[PDB]
Amino acid sequence: EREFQRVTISGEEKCGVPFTDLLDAAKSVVRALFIREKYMALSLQSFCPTTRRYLQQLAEKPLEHPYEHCEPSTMPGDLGLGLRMVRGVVHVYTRCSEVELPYPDLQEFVADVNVLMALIINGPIKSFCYRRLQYLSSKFQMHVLLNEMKELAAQKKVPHRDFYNIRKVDTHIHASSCMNQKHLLRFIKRAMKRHLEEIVHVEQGREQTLREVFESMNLTAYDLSVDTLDVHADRNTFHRFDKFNAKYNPIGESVLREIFIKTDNRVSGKYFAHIIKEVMSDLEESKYQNAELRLSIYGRSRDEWDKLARWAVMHRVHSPNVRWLVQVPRLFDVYRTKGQLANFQEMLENIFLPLFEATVHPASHPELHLFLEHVDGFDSVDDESKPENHVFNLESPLPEAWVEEDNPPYAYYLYYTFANMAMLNHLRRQRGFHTFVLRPHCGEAGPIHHLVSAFMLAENISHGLLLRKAPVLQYLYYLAQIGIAMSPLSNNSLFLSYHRNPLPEYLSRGLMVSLSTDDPLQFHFTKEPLMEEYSIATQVWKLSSCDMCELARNSVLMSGFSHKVKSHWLGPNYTKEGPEGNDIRRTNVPDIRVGYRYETLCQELALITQAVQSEMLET
Amino acid sequence: EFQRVTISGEEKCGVPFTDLLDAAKSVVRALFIREKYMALSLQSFCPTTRRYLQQLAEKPQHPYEHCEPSTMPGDLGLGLRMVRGVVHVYTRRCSEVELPYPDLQEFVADVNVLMALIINGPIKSFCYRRLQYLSSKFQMHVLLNEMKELAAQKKVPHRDFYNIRKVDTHIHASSCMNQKHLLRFIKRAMKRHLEEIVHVEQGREQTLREVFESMNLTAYDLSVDTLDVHADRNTFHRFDKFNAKYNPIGESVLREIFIKTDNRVSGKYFAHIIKEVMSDLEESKYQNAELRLSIYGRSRDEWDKLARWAVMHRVHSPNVRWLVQVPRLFDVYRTKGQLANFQEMLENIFLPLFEATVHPASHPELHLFLEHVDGFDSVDDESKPENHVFNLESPLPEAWVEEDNPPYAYYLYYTFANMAMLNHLRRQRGFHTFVLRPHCGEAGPIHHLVSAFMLAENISHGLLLRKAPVLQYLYYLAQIGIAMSPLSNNSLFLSYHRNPLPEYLSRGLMVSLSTDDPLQFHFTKEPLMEEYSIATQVWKLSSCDMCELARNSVLMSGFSHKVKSHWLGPNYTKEGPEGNDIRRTNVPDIRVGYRYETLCQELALITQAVQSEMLETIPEE
Amino acid sequence: EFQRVTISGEEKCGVPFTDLLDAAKSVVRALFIREKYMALSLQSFCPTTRRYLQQLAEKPLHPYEHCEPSTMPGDLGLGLRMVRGVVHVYTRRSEVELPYPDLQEFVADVNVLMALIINGPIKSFCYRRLQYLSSKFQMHVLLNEMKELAAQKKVPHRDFYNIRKVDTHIHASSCMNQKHLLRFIKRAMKRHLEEIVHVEQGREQTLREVFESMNLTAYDLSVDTLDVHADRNTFHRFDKFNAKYNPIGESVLREIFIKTDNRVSGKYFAHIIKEVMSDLEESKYQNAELRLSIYGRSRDEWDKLARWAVMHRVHSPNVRWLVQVPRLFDVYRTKGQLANFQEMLENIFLPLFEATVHPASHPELHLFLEHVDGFDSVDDESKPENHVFNLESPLPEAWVEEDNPPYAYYLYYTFANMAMLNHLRRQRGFHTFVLRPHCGEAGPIHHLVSAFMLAENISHGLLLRKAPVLQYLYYLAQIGIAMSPLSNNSLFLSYHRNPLPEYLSRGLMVSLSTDDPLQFHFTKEPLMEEYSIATQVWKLSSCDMCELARNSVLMSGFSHKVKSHWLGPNYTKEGPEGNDIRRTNVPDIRVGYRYETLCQELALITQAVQSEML
Numbered sequence A: 001e002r003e004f005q006r007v008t009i010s011g012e013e014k015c016g017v018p019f020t021d022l023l024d025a026a027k028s029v030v031r032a033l034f035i036r037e038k039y040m041a042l043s044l045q046s047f048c049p050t051t052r053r054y055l056q057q058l059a060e061k062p063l064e065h066p067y068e069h070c071e072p073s074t075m076p077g078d079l080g081l082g083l084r085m086v087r088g089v090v091h092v093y094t095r096c097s098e099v100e101l102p103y104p105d106l107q108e109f110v111a112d113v114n115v116l117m118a119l120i121i122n123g124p125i126k127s128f129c130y131r132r133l134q135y136l137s138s139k140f141q142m143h144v145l146l147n148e149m150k151e152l153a154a155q156k157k158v159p160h161r162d163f164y165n166i167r168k169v170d171t172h173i174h175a176s177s178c179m180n181q182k183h184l185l186r187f188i189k190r191a192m193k194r195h196l197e198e199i200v201h202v203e204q205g206r207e208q209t210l211r212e213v214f215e216s217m218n219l220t221a222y223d224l225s226v227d228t229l230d231v232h233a234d235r236n237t238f239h240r241f242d243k244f245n246a247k248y249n250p251i252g253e254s255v256l257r258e259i260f261i262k263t264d265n266r267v268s269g270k271y272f273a274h275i276i277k278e279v280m281s282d283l284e285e286s287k288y289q290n291a292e293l294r295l296s297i298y299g300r301s302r303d304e305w306d307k308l309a310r311w312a313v314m315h316r317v318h319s320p321n322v323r324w325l326v327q328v329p330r331l332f333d334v335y336r337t338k339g340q341l342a343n344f345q346e347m348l349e350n351i352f353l354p355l356f357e358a359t360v361h362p363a364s365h366p367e368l369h370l371f372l373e374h375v376d377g378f379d380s381v382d383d384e385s386k387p388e389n390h391v392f393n394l395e396s397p398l399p400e401a402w403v404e405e406d407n408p409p410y411a412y413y414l415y416y417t418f419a420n421m422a423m424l425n426h427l428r429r430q431r432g433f434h435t436f437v438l439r440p441h442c443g444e445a446g447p448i449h450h451l452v453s454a455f456m457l458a459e460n461i462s463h464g465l466l467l468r469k470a471p472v473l474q475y476l477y478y479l480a481q482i483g484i485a486m487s488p489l490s491n492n493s494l495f496l497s498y499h500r501n502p503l504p505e506y507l508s509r510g511l512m513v514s515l516s517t518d519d520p521l522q523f524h525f526t527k528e529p530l531m532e533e534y535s536i537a538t539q540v541w542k543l544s545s546c547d548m549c550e551l552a553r554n555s556v557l558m559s560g561f562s563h564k565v566k567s568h569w570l571g572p573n574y575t576k577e578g579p580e581g582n583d584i585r586r587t588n589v590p591d592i593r594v595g596y597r598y599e600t601l602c603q604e605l606a607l608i609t610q611a612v613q614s615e616m617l618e619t
Numbered sequence B: 001e002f003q004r005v006t007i008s009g010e011e012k013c014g015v016p017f018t019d020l021l022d023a024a025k026s027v028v029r030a031l032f033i034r035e036k037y038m039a040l041s042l043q044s045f046c047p048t049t050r051r052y053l054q055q056l057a058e059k060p061q062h063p064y065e066h067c068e069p070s071t072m073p074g075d076l077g078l079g080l081r082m083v084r085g086v087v088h089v090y091t092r093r094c095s096e097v098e099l100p101y102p103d104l105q106e107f108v109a110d111v112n113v114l115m116a117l118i119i120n121g122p123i124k125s126f127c128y129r130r131l132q133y134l135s136s137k138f139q140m141h142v143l144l145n146e147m148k149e150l151a152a153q154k155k156v157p158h159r160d161f162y163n164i165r166k167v168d169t170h171i172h173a174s175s176c177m178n179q180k181h182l183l184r185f186i187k188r189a190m191k192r193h194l195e196e197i198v199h200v201e202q203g204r205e206q207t208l209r210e211v212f213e214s215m216n217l218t219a220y221d222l223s224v225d226t227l228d229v230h231a232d233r234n235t236f237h238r239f240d241k242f243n244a245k246y247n248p249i250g251e252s253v254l255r256e257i258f259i260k261t262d263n264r265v266s267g268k269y270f271a272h273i274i275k276e277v278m279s280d281l282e283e284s285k286y287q288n289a290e291l292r293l294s295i296y297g298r299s300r301d302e303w304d305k306l307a308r309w310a311v312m313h314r315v316h317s318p319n320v321r322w323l324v325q326v327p328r329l330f331d332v333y334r335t336k337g338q339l340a341n342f343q344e345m346l347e348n349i350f351l352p353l354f355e356a357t358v359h360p361a362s363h364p365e366l367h368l369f370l371e372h373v374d375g376f377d378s379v380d381d382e383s384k385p386e387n388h389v390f391n392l393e394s395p396l397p398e399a400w401v402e403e404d405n406p407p408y409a410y411y412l413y414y415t416f417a418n419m420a421m422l423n424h425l426r427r428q429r430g431f432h433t434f435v436l437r438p439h440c441g442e443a444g445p446i447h448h449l450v451s452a453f454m455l456a457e458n459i460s461h462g463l464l465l466r467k468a469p470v471l472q473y474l475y476y477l478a479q480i481g482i483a484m485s486p487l488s489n490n491s492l493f494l495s496y497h498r499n500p501l502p503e504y505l506s507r508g509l510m511v512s513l514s515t516d517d518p519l520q521f522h523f524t525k526e527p528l529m530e531e532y533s534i535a536t537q538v539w540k541l542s543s544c545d546m547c548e549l550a551r552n553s554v555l556m557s558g559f560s561h562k563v564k565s566h567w568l569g570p571n572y573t574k575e576g577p578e579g580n581d582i583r584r585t586n587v588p589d590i591r592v593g594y595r596y597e598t599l600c601q602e603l604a605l606i607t608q609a610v611q612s613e614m615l616e617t618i619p620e621e
Numbered sequence C: 001e002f003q004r005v006t007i008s009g010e011e012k013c014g015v016p017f018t019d020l021l022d023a024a025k026s027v028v029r030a031l032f033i034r035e036k037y038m039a040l041s042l043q044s045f046c047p048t049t050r051r052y053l054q055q056l057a058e059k060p061l062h063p064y065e066h067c068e069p070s071t072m073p074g075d076l077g078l079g080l081r082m083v084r085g086v087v088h089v090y091t092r093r094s095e096v097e098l099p100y101p102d103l104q105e106f107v108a109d110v111n112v113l114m115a116l117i118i119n120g121p122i123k124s125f126c127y128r129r130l131q132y133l134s135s136k137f138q139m140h141v142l143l144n145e146m147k148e149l150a151a152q153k154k155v156p157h158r159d160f161y162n163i164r165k166v167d168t169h170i171h172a173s174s175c176m177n178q179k180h181l182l183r184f185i186k187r188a189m190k191r192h193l194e195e196i197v198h199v200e201q202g203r204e205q206t207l208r209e210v211f212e213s214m215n216l217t218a219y220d221l222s223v224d225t226l227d228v229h230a231d232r233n234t235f236h237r238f239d240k241f242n243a244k245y246n247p248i249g250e251s252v253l254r255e256i257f258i259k260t261d262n263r264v265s266g267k268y269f270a271h272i273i274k275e276v277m278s279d280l281e282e283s284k285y286q287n288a289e290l291r292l293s294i295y296g297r298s299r300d301e302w303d304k305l306a307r308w309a310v311m312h313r314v315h316s317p318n319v320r321w322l323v324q325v326p327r328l329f330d331v332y333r334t335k336g337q338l339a340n341f342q343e344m345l346e347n348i349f350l351p352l353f354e355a356t357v358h359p360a361s362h363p364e365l366h367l368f369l370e371h372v373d374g375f376d377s378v379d380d381e382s383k384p385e386n387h388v389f390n391l392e393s394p395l396p397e398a399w400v401e402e403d404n405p406p407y408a409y410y411l412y413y414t415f416a417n418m419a420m421l422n423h424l425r426r427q428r429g430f431h432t433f434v435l436r437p438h439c440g441e442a443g444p445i446h447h448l449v450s451a452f453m454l455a456e457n458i459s460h461g462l463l464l465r466k467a468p469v470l471q472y473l474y475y476l477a478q479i480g481i482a483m484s485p486l487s488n489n490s491l492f493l494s495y496h497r498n499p500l501p502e503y504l505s506r507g508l509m510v511s512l513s514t515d516d517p518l519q520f521h522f523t524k525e526p527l528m529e530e531y532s533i534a535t536q537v538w539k540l541s542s543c544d545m546c547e548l549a550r551n552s553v554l555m556s557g558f559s560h561k562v563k564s565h566w567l568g569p570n571y572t573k574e575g576p577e578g579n580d581i582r583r584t585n586v587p588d589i590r591v592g593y594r595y596e597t598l599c600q601e602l603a604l605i606t607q608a609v610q611s612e613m614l
């Protein structure tokens, strides 16, 4: 079905506030969106087409097996370009003259931040945005009451298509925890038998086999249990992210984490690759389920990228249902305190210089060149509840000058990851290579202004719980249609209770939200964590079938999968805006639901933009 | 060892001795009523409760591989006749066999006492305070002992939640398969055989494809949405809509073909679906189910027809136990002229069972099938109002010819009365006895829980205990098992955050988790694991709590003593910590010890109050 | 006597000794930090906490009718000079040996406490103890509430209506309800028809003329017209709440009626307060601790405030004065009204030091300070902070930027100057002051760290529910918390989310207050209205209500003589010995339970530490 009952408001002041208040909010909202659009364009990241169309009216200028063979000889040739990091950003040179890439200006970024920082504490704008957010919830409630039967009928009438055969993407999941506890326990106990003489660990210079590792712990294969591994988050982990980090060590053993959960170890990440490929097998068996695993590049060593690429190539860690995102833990303070890094610039060099070198000279890093074909972007992870005592501004030390053992704040990490990524994408675009996106963890806990940083620089975010405390930011995320990969089960076990999770309000109000498992090892109990994640949410918040499919469609849209794959998944016209881009035959989402979302977004954007043009100045 | 919370003072219940004495006398009297009827029907009664009551009491090879009637036990030549709704056994098919035939007047008298009890305000407040105390003590116990409980679970070798026995204590066979599983089975059937005749419409024979062609539905076009067998939010407080979910694609014919045991194809499709589910339980090893099979009492041959269906299709599994449900649809049958009177329905349900016990060769397939049948169930929309109170003025079953459906207590009493006599006869021959495990307290009148408290070994749902403190207090003291299905409740009557399950578990009531109807509610391929997950996440249950629920499920189950000996250990019959082995249960003795002591202390509080008065009444007379 | 709950076991606290020992050492260290600064500033410290800490440290732990400067104490000829933001006293106008605070020591103490509040292992321990206290109280009530009520019924005469209740946290500018303000305004418009109340762009206007410009008559005026009451639109909009201080959205009307300094010399504002004082005196048992504003903008504010009170006889036996300093340095610096933060400090403290040294120089202030008990800090606490107060922070004289100094910056220098003032006043036998700031309502949690070190007691304290170690430390230290659930319901935290029942259940010294009756309450008795709603919503018992009233009196700044008359001569005793049901209507069962619970918790922490010291 396509036609549906529509809610309309008649009379003057349709927004419920006097025009003077509306104009003030509109000016700030439009300016904020322009700021985000600028940096998305700068970094070659996506910006909502619907938002861009409405903003163009007020815009001065126009807007907008693979690893079987690894032969460097057939790879693209060397461009001979020189590389050097200047003030925390990689610069490209002809060999010599600087290549005119749009190198970000820090002062411009700081000025933009200050505008948003003042905006998020603007009282009058806060009330206006909160009123609009309540309006969106009220309108959606009316839409459901007057059209859910019609929406259900459309789902019923579609042939062949149901929730079990629509595409679903685990938009936010970590490789180190992609397996369930029982799966990990079985894999370890199988490994204790198959190969028995291989040296798997060196303890104080003493080479040890896996059996000798377990005998040192006074543990037998029979004695091992899920409780023994102790890798599951419990109620005592709540508000204790440090205790959650400890769950990554089985049996409280860093050696077991090294052997089975690390890509780089004495076994060349043999066990970790095998477990991932087993997870890949389950994903391929399910056909319709996909995941975007997070692999760790710590930036501690210059060789991490090459070793990670070789690890994937040698073990053939690849699947059509898996896309890779590289996460950078914010652990500079730990590294600096141990003397393993000289300055924050060295950490940035270990993260981006190998990438820049691979682009200019693919044969220089042949394994990395192949691996990057499946790497979509960067992620930033750390205990986001930790306080920040340093404000990122022009007075902050540059990365080369940052030699103290203090961890730079969240915005410091994000800006330099963004700045280097933006230049890298420009270089890779010129050669026709795949570009990257920035998809950080944001809003889970800690200062609200972390969401200001992501709004400026992030393609999409994960968690985003604190948007409920910032009406203007939540309103902007809706207007910009910024994807949010949420993990209610993870939040329930760490920060925010399930019944208080803001996901229901985000979904009702039209934010592009998707469901994710985060760390199935520490949380889920079934053999299909993503289905279990969908189950709990659908029951506790009593989500309708249309709501479930809408979440699945959102997960695909915010994923890093290629256009060709998405064309098969959602249809060749999926890139179109509104109902035109939706095919119920492939998504099981009625056009009535998509139509309502598109009209609601268009109405909201029209309200803000038309208010700006309606201002009358007096000489 | 674990930290124990102790009270110090003169009155440690919180109430004046007069309030304690009044409540204690009624509670003890209520417990005696239940003990009398459990003994009458050879049903289990909490050993801990009985021991405290005694102080106040003046009285002290596939099983279906072969079917050879000749090798079966011989005929005892006993006559059978239903008298006033209860079967009587006779020496010849002649004297009446001296069996404890229930007296209805005695039953009504006990009911009236309990009905007055459940509205006693002073007693209600007393029990409510005790329930709050039980919750408070558990909260302090958890705070002061959860770390020690967790350490014990870490210490025990090999044992974890994934290798402990879990029983789906309440699940219906007609809905034991998930929606995706049913869709795949239907799609496969359409491909395989056009030979099968599945349905006759107006005397016109039709095949499976022809039936689907009439609806103009192709195999490819079919989807889970087309089946519409899933309970959505529109089913909330709409049990009639849930009834409609039993029809695939909203068709009764499809339900008969795939979901029913008696049809043109001898229920082969339903048997295969069950046996496919049974395979998964065997693959999981540690997961078991108690599927509910329907005996409607509509036809005298239903028991034989159900037994032949199991024997011919070899529907058996070591991880599956059978409980037979009797839908309360006498009004539907009577209105259609299918039963003469309610007595005929009882005879259709119980006469074949008595005859099989007396003369196994008369019902050779029923004799084999009953080896895996453990008890009876009563299912219907419990929200439906009742206009008739079951009393001596109520028509006897043979006299009940009106099309009105008898009330809940009417069904339960006569199911109980006939079951008790059947158990006595089966015990004489050494055969397995039965128990009465009805759906109770999900919705509707509170007094339904009064009926089950008297006659039921355990119940399912039991949500309304939260609205009757005295009944919830009694169920705790009697340790009456409660099979709860929180997901089913979320889509039908009560939301997850309002569900009283966490309060029941904390206060010490014997609660277990169940799926009810996986077809209409669950989304994953392991519904029971999905059920445990949601409950653990919403109520932040610990590993100890999860394992304690699994232990309760086994204890509430109908599995044999030998089976439970391997599952829970040879000494599982012992009360308190002595009966618990973490090496098989993963439940720390700290948890079991706390429960056992709390139950004994509560019984001691009530028992001493009764003793005190009788001591002080001696001078008075 | 009452049924008591006892714990038997090897680990009675619920955690292994190693976890207990680590938490106890930090908890003991934190308590010593507070005791050090309370002693330095001559502020109270919980006697029960001190006794258990001593074992761990051998070192010991009408008044305004006549104003005659000649009769006042003579001049000591002592010099005064700000030194790094703190007033220093000199023998003439050598340095007087006063315990001048050391900033480096303060910063070092802060860093330790800041680390403690983000220590995961200690946070879980404290949270577990907090849950234990709630569980223990739950069990206590279940078994003893009947006995507590029986004592209340048996005690002669005393009930909730004849026990003393003190509004421990209320602002003078909002101490009247909206209907009271409306009646007063209409009354004034019919009086003093020939008197200038305001000049509008060089045009003198009388009270009637001001209303003529607004096109409003006395009849037209209504409660709606004033628009001084908060509503659902005021939620999380403290700026809108400040706007409510302007009747009819007019700053002039606020100036005429709700300010002590104006053309009419604060005539109307004094009269309204006296009307409230009269209502308080008629009630006999209800008291208040009103907040008066000293902005620190001008050097003469203290003298002008004291003159206002003396001339209009703004005094009541049921009222104690606390002086609030709005954190508005940014506004003053931006407009050029101040050059640096030290000037703000000079305007706030120098007149007080001068009055102490030479009372005859500030004769009105000398009399007025007899009824002033302490200082207060007020501002939109939800505002973020981008500057951390440490040794690298500018000194007050060097702070010239328009940025508002952080909360700790205000609190430390107010604490430092106040402490020296108290030492001087004690030498002369004058009344000393205490620091009672608004804290924990919103904004950063570390504000509660600052008040824990420097504040006698706090108001609001809502964020303690998010900081287990801080709430556990406040409980052990028995820091008074003045809570205003109705105010929070209309500003930050809804009534059903208010942590007051948890604090009261766990034994924290909590009291009920109205905060701003003008913007919040509807009835003729805002304090009674505040108590009633708390009782109904949380189903508080008569014992719970009376315990709150007793806590309010104990937190208050009323004299020892008055409190002895109120709570009895022995009220200073600890535990049940200090409670008289005939005076408080609080059964000794309740007081006994609180005392035993507090002592047991303190013993657990202290005895665990002693084992390492033994």
Ligand SMILES: Nc1ncnc2c1ncn2[C@@H]1O[C@H](COP(=O)(O)O)[C@@H](O)[C@H]1O
Pocket: B172, B174, B243, B246, B260, B293, B294, B327, B328, B329, B379, B380, B381, B517
């Ligand atoms: N979980 C249930 N609750 C209530 N009535 C039920 C349930 N299951 C089956 N019934 C009733 O039993 C009859 C059908 O049995 P069956 O075909 O096995 O599903 C119908 O009258 C249903 O209303």
Ligand SMILES: [Zn+2]
Pocket: A172, A173, A174, A441, A462, A518, A519
């Ligand atoms: Zn994550």
Ligand SMILES: [Zn+2]
Pocket: B170, B172, B439, B460, B516, B517
């Ligand atoms: Zn059921």
Ligand SMILES: [Zn+2]
Pocket: C169, C170, C171, C438, C459, C515
């Ligand atoms: Zn205040």
